[PDB]
């Protein structure tokens, strides 16, 4: 069902797309994985240490 939902949108079903480096501007081979992840900022700051 993840594959089906992905294909509902026009995204590549494999889950991995092809990026481009920022500095050089040339392509990464080996298509990489990109998505959306939920992240939290834990209560261990640097300025309290």
């Amino acid at each position: 069902e993840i594959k089906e939902l992905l294909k509902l949108g026009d995204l590549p079903t494999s889950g991995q797309i092809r990026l481009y480096d920022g500095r050089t501007g040339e392509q990464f081979e080996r298509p990489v994985t990109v998505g959306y992840m939920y992240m939290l900022k834990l209560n261990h700051l640097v300025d309290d240490k």
């Binding site: 990026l19 990489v32 990109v34 992840m37 939920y38 300025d47």
Partner: protein, 224 residues
């Protein structure tokens, strides 16, 4: 909101105390940044004591770990509401479902070693859009002990310091509400009975948002 939850959010959100869950469904009569008023439906109303439900929202107040908790309305004029529904979102909630952090676009790939062992490389949009900054609230106290050589006071005058550092103290000796102090400043000016003035801890910035003073009985109360 978290893009991929486990459906067990709303329960944790409303079964904790932070969100302001309605008690009798009705119609919002006037919302505001601080309070809410609900005209109760006809059915859920007692015969006498008609009244209308009213909620007050706790604005910025320190938690136990110095993280500010406040509540924001999540409704508007004319919106019906039902029993058990959510009205005011607390800290880290969104339309009454738990939301602790942010969802961000992630790509798995080594990048010039800047994520060697477990480190994380963070683009500058994450800080430009200001979507991780967290508000902290600290409480600083200053007491006027009753010691030998007589007691000591909080007079605005202290020795051997230029008026520049005193620009932020009013005539009494307590900083104004809203002054933008920085590292190494004077919040209340105390005197060595014979300079014990409280000072901001080094390195911290921020704005003063509230001042309180308690006085023991039998002592005249100064202007502030």
């Amino acid at each position: 909101k978290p893009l991929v939850g486990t459906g067990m959010e709303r329960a944790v959100a409303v079964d904790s105390g932070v969100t302001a869950v309605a008690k009798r469904g009705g119609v919002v009569q006037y919302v505001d940044a601080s309070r809410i008023v609900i005209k109760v439906n006809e059915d859920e109303m007692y015969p006498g004591e008609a009244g209308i439900d009213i909620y007050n929202l706790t604005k910025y107040t320190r938690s136990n770990q110095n993280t500010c908790i406040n509540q924001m309305p999540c409704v508007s004029l004319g919106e019906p509401v039902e029993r058990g529904d959510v009205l005011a979102d607390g800290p880290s909630t969104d339309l009454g479902e738990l939301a602790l952090g942010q969802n961000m676009r992630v790509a798995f790939m080594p990048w010039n070693g800047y994520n060697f062992e477990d480190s994380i490389l963070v683009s500058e949009r994450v800080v430009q859009e200001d979507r991780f900054t967290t508000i902290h609230i600290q409480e600083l106290a200053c007491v006027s002990r009753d010691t030998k050589l007589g007691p000591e006071e909080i007079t605005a005058d202290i020795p051997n310091v230029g008026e520049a550092a005193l620009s932020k103290l009013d005539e009494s000796g307590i900083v104004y509400i809203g002054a933008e102090v920085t590292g190494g400043d004077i919040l209340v000016g105390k005197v060595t009975p014979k300079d014990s003035s409280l000072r901001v801890p080094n390195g911290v910035s921020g704005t003063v948002i509230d001042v309180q003073v308690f006085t023991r009985d039998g002592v005249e109360k100064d202007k502030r």
